[PDB]
Design a protein around this ligand. Sequence first.
Ligand SMILES: Nc1ccn([C@H]2C[C@H](O)[C@@H](COP(=O)(O)OP(=O)(O)OP(=O)(O)O)O2)c(=O)n1
Ligand SMILES: Nc1ccn([C@H]2C[C@H](O)[C@@H](COP(=O)(O)OP(=O)(O)OP(=O)(O)O)O2)c(=O)n1
Ligand SMILES: Nc1ccn([C@H]2C[C@H](O)[C@@H](COP(=O)(O)OP(=O)(O)OP(=O)(O)O)O2)c(=O)n1
Ligand SMILES: [Mn+2]
Ligand SMILES: [Mn+2]
Ligand SMILES: [Mn+2]
Ligand SMILES: [Mn+2]
Ligand SMILES: [Mn+2]
Ligand SMILES: [Mn+2]
Lengths: 494, 494, 494
Amino acid sequence: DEKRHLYEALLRHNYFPNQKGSISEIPPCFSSRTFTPEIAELISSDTSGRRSLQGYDCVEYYATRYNNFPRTLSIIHPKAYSKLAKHIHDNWEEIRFIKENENSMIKPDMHADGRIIIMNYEDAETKTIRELNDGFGRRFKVNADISGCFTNIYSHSIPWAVIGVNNAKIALKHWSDKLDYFQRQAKRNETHGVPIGPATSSIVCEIILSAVDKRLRDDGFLFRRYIDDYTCYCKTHDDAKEFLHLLGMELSKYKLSLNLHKTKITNLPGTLNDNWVSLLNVNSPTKKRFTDQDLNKLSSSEVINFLDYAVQLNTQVGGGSILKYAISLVINNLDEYTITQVYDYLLNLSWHYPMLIPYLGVLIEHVYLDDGDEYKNKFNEILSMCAENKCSDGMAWTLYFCIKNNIDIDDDVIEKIICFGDCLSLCLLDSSDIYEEKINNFVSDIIKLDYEYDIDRYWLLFYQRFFKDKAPSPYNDKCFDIMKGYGVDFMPDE
Amino acid sequence: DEKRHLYEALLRHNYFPNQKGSISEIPPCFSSRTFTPEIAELISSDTSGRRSLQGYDCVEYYATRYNNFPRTLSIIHPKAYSKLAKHIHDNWEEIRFIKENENSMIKPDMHADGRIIIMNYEDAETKTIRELNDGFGRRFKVNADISGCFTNIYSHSIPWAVIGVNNAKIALKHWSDKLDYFQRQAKRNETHGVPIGPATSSIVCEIILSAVDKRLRDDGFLFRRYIDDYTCYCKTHDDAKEFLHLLGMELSKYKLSLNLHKTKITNLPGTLNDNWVSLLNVNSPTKKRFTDQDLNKLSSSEVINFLDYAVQLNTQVGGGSILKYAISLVINNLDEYTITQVYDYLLNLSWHYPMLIPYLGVLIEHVYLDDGDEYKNKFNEILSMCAENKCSDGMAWTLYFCIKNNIDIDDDVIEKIICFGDCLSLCLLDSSDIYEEKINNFVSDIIKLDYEYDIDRYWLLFYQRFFKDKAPSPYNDKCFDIMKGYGVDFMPDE
Amino acid sequence: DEKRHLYEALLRHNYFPNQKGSISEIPPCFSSRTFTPEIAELISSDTSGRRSLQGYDCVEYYATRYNNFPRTLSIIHPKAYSKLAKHIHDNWEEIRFIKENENSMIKPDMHADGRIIIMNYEDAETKTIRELNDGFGRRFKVNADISGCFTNIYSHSIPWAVIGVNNAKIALKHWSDKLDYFQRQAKRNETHGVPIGPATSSIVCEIILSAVDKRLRDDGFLFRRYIDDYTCYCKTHDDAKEFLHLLGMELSKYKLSLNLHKTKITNLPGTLNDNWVSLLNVNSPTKKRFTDQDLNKLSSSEVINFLDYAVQLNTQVGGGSILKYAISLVINNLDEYTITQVYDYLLNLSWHYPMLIPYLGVLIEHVYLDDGDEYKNKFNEILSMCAENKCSDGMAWTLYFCIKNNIDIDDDVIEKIICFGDCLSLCLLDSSDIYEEKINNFVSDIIKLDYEYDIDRYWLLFYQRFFKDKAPSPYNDKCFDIMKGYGVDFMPDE
DNA sequence: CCCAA
DNA sequence: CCCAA
DNA sequence: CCCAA
Ligand SMILES: Nc1ccn([C@H]2C[C@H](O)[C@@H](COP(=O)(O)OP(=O)(O)OP(=O)(O)O)O2)c(=O)n1
Ligand SMILES: Nc1ccn([C@H]2C[C@H](O)[C@@H](COP(=O)(O)OP(=O)(O)OP(=O)(O)O)O2)c(=O)n1
Ligand SMILES: Nc1ccn([C@H]2C[C@H](O)[C@@H](COP(=O)(O)OP(=O)(O)OP(=O)(O)O)O2)c(=O)n1
Ligand SMILES: [Mn+2]
Ligand SMILES: [Mn+2]
Ligand SMILES: [Mn+2]
Ligand SMILES: [Mn+2]
Ligand SMILES: [Mn+2]
Ligand SMILES: [Mn+2]
């Protein structure tokens, strides 16, 4: 069944921000499996406990983008997420009209690993064929995206996009009103915005934007959208301005507006990908496959010169993930001679850009970690700068690398981790069990603060301490006991 | 004999604009073989008929350059061209002094296919050796070309360049005066300019410019010329200015002048080819030959990224045929997996630039033209764009592709073809025989206009309708009957 | 022993400017072997003769840099150099503290060929690993070099850097005061500057700059130096300014100052090499080794296009030896088909840039030098332009190529060689023996000038004429007779 | 080798 | 094929 | 690996 696949995707595969297909933003130690549909079915049925504050807060995660900009990912509290996933699954025969959208390329699908929503799983050549077919006969292209799409979704517009704005306002129950209520309860009983990273909020964004896609399709516009980014192919410039006007109208019906910084009109024939994609791919040392494994093993000079050229391209242009793409080009074709030099280059670059930190794990097995203690200083310096820069992806990834490889962590950098106080880094330190007393003091300060939302911001740390029998449940409800008795661990071992 | 080779080259190989060696501007359906020496010798002997207007007009052809600029090629009326070719050949012992010019790189030669004049047949490495030898010891280079060379040749300067300006003016018969008269009769009895595309007018341009080459050679200038483009290599900047002054003097003796837009002086060592030639060739996926056919078959990613990089370089520089060179680099090394994707890229690019339309025929055999009817809309959209842009090369090439592959043509674009009214497109539609009535109405309107020059502009269409016995001969002379009786078809089948 | 290796390095390997490891600035006909420590020990013991002028002048050599700038190399007179080398060797247990410097990368070492000091023998990958290790954790890099380092070394600062500035001034014998006196006698009894090219003056520069390296190391600065170029890696911009201030202080203690033109602060991550290094290496046709000799033999088009792209990169940037690196990339991977075309390209480029003249000797064997006399005009034109530009490296290299390949030299270019009057070109003409009378007139004019320094500027020519018994010794001392009796030839045959 | 002029 | 949105 | 400084 496909409805059951929705349930398993919502809880076990796309509860955490696992939407990135190439490499996960969150380290693989955190996971959402062994959280079955039956367990959320029990949690939604549970009525015990009482909370002074309406709604729930979420575990916060600040991931660096290509330009070192923070992106706010959220892990929803399992009570609110269990109710939301239950209500989404129980009415998928009313919701699955977002599956049959030809203008939304990123949408729920029945994938092999189980995830409904994977960003950029379709790969650039299937994108290339479609972009070539769409761009034919048109001489202008429009790139326009919503300004704050996920962060300013108005939750009460969820009923509107289901049944029309006017009919929903006149009717002021239906399933989408309850979906509105549950999506509000997911984030502090707040109507504006949705959490970023779970697939329930991406489903909500698909539900809202599918009405705009429908009313743009009915006017004969040939357009594609990737989440919030609309690309349009127009024969004339006036049709481009008319598409922009109609898109602004239909988004303004749902309290949404265009990002006019990124909204631009270019003259076809433009590059199908970005410019730096083609510049890196013509200069790539692995752009030709020789079908024998010895011939495509790159020497040290080739990889080093490609990485320096990529650094120059990223510094000169700065309009995309040049370094990310470039290191992912040449990281699997190394031989054992240049593993250490490329690892040193990646260590320097991953210090200078935290987004390149997750790559080290694919080269961390071949490099001898002990060596002359130098890599311990490497990782501690990266940890310290990650604490100063208040980034979560690099910080958690570096802690994962230190713990998984039995690499010692200094006390001063533990103190600045405490001062940073991001939830998932503290969950990793809790899993280390060395710093149990300092984690105890931190969660104790959260407890005597007496704020429900501050406990909700660290529910994952509190539940991980509860699962190893090191802390009582801060909540008076039985959701944590239901999760523990039925075996839910968010840091599972093999 | 070399004189006989001249006559066969003039009639069967270089009557049509066939000077491009890589790919013909005119589709292969139009041809000038089965127009033997004997038929031209008969037509020159014919004295029947009468014409109210002196001279003849020519079939007009508008070919897009690299920057989408129209270039006017002309197909001379076979009476005038037959007389002109006979007069050129019968005195080749007086004319062949243009063969022994070391400064004219493009000139008549005894080629394998039969053509006397092929532009850029020597290839860039034989050009490289000569350019390296010429550039040595000189630190300045001059690039200067005639402003409107073929379009502003004075016909009366043809006797001058044979016997001196002053001697010919004092003498005011000689063979060059009759060559003047015949070159005038080729284009409406007009002294100014020559038709572009036949080799008789290129022979005339060689005759005129060889005197300038002689009086530039006598002063010791080391220079080369490609038709009208003069390159010069000077040790000093003042020798460059003196070469420019002497070239201006000797061209002004023949009512000719330099294009000072393209006249520029650069500092050696400059590159032998253009810049984008070098950037395309260092980034080319086929720049190394592995001597086995499986290893140099390019994958889809390599060709797609090279074409995208070529599009970026053509947009950024815009100083040459970047896209033409780039697709000719990688079009023969494809495998069957990327054939359809490259065809889609070529279809989009050939819509955006008509000069890339002739390439499609090398990939039109492998691609299934029926498919899901999409390629018919591709070709019809390209046809409508070609009719809007008033280009003849892409429009006739697309007609050739539609007719040769049994691809249907919509009626609206047929009406827009007739509105355009190019001669060779109407010849192709005549060859299709579906649109016989509309072509009949068009040539009937031309007939009731009662203008000799308007019939001469479409003589090829009129003769093709006469050859299939669908229209009477508009001319009262017997040249068309001589051509029909002895078997001249300008759309011959194999 | 390592002290003996110092002696053999000082006399037989690094007396001449042989510090460049890739290709020697001086042609290999000039050499300093068969000049053993015994002969220099004899010359230092010799007390015969008398000189009116204190000190000695040195043979002058003007080598073009990458930007065609003249660099002044000097060949020290063998009396002064023998005394200086003996005094350097006899106290190496006091001097070898420059060997144990971790901040000086170019320093004396026990090399395989025998040289103590080779510029950039470490190769760019060993530099890459060290640069990656140093660049970690730092976000600013400082590049600062001494303004006139070798040309404005104060000789009296040689004692200071040995024993402290204040102690040496208070003491105003010690071995470093005698090293001061001998380094003064090496160049005209002048305190400012040292000759460039011998290793004794590089030893002196290491001695002076090691105190600055020590007092920069004691402050904890992580820095490297290549002769006079200091690179520093600072976490903060303030520490970068503090490093610049302290470097200025410690250099000003020794009458030295930074070149603020080349002193700059860049933001890490910057490229390990220069930019054009990476651009040339991603576009290099030989960047992949296929481990079979037939597959990496480059075709003509690849080398021609790479050289054209390199010419464009050198013209566009002009910040390094783009052409030197580029031709050294692809000169050993040629096959016999493109040898002549690449040799012609090198002939044109080596005319336009004399630095590329030494490369011709690696392709001069395969190219037939007789041919149609054209290469004789090539070499004579290059000789003439080398005479006009007053450059010594290309001029002497071209004389070496003409003499070694039995290529005739015209009389007019011999006359402008005479007018230029560089010493090593005249030594090569002396070795040719054709122009013995003109060399005799030139040295006779030097003799009747009656200036000791003007004889010292051509001591190499005078000694080479003495060794073939064609001229008497201009000096009244017995150093030349000691050198002749023990078999010292600076133009030795195999 | 593969363009243009 | 290998990014992002 | 292949330059410079
Ligand atoms: N790992 C994930 C999971 C989900 N999303 C969602 C949230 C974003 O709203 C949407 C794409 O929108 P943008 O990245 O363009 O971001 P915004 O719309 O918030 O802002 P802006 O237009 O200013 O960039 O993708 C994401 O970015 N990253
Ligand atoms: N297929 C052909 C056959 C012949 N020619 C001739 C006619 C041109 O006059 C000549 C070369 O001249 P240019 O292309 O430089 O063009 P013009 O001299 O007419 O103009 P301009 O200098 O403005 O470009 O080559 C051509 O261009 N194309
Ligand atoms: N063949 C050789 C042998 C030795 N050196 C030395 C002398 C130079 O002083 C030193 C490097 O310093 P710079 O080339 O930077 O030269 P300067 O310090 O004299 O000048 P500037 O900073 O203006 O370039 O290397 C050299 O350049 N070439
Ligand atoms: Mn957005
Ligand atoms: Mn977006
Ligand atoms: Mn012209
Ligand atoms: Mn310096
Ligand atoms: Mn021209
Ligand atoms: Mn320097």
